[PDB]
Amino acid sequence: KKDIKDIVNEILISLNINESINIEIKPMKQKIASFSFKTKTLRLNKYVVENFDEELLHYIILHELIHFKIKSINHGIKFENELRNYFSKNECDEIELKIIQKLI
Amino acid sequence: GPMAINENKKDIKDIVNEILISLNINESINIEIKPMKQKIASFSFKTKTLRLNKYVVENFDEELLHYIILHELIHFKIKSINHGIKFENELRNYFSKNECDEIELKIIQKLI
Ligand SMILES: [Cl-]
Ligand SMILES: [Cl-]
Ligand SMILES: [Cl-]
Ligand SMILES: [Zn+2]
Ligand SMILES: [Zn+2]
Known part of the structure; x- marks a missing residue:
């Protein structure tokens, strides 16, 4: 329900990051997410954004x-x-298992 | 230093056949290696088809x-x-x- 860019923006602030980034939500054939240090661009796989649970x-x-x-x-x-x-x-173990069960 | 020679990639069909042998499965299956948007792998009981994501088959290590x-x-x-x-x-x-958690984390970190 919460817009993906609102989630990214909340995380940038809770991590106390003070360097602006670019956010791209697009179909990705090779990855789920990536971060380019060169262009400061966060890329998120559109299918994952629209189908994976918020956690x-x-x-x-x-x-x-x-x-x-x-x-x-x-x-x-x-x-x-x-x-x-x-x-x-323990929370990371549960999330990591959930991500694997979404992929295979 | 010299780079140790990256060993010959085992054919995807050979990896599948070795698992069918170790699991003692004698039922015939179809193997489909194609671009997949929703998963990296799936299995259909209806058509007995193992589906594997094309980019994953071409870039992930044998393990x-x-x-x-x-x-x-x-x-x-x-x-x-x-x-x-x-x-x-x-x-x-x-x-x-523990070994499963380790391999599953390697899979996740190939994609994030
Ligand atoms: Cl891509
Ligand atoms: Cl980079
Ligand atoms: Cl162990
Ligand atoms: Zn399963
Ligand atoms: Zn990483």
Whole structure:
């Protein structure tokens, strides 16, 4: 029900990001979501945006915007500490299983 | 340093046949590798068709392709679209819960 750009904007602010980005919602044949550090563009797969539950979208957007905040493409302790401000390890396990069950 | 030679990609049909053998499935299946917008893999009981996303088949490592195909073919073996204890029983002959979480995270992080 909540517009996808409103969700992205809420996450940019809750992550305390103060660098403007571009948001593109488009069909994507190779990915669900991506972030270009060169053009500061967040790309979200249109089908996923229109068909995945809000919590899965939250997790997906957080993944990309945490990379942008910490200026790292890796998923170690700096990434994990940012994600833990939103979802516990057990909550991430449940979301990750739900995303897989939507793909296969 | 010199890059270690990226080993010859196993043909998708060979990955499928190895799983049908290990799962002891002698029912015939159709394999469709096509662009898919909604999923990366599916299985139709109506036509006995394993559907695989074309970009995924051409770019994912063997370990991820094996896991994805194994998931669909376990459903076909147990004659259930669900992930009950009968699904877990077949999957556990291949991977522990921790190993499944690891591979599933690699799949997710190929797409996000
Ligand atoms: Cl694309
Ligand atoms: Cl980039
Ligand atoms: Cl283990
Ligand atoms: Zn990432
Ligand atoms: Zn399934």
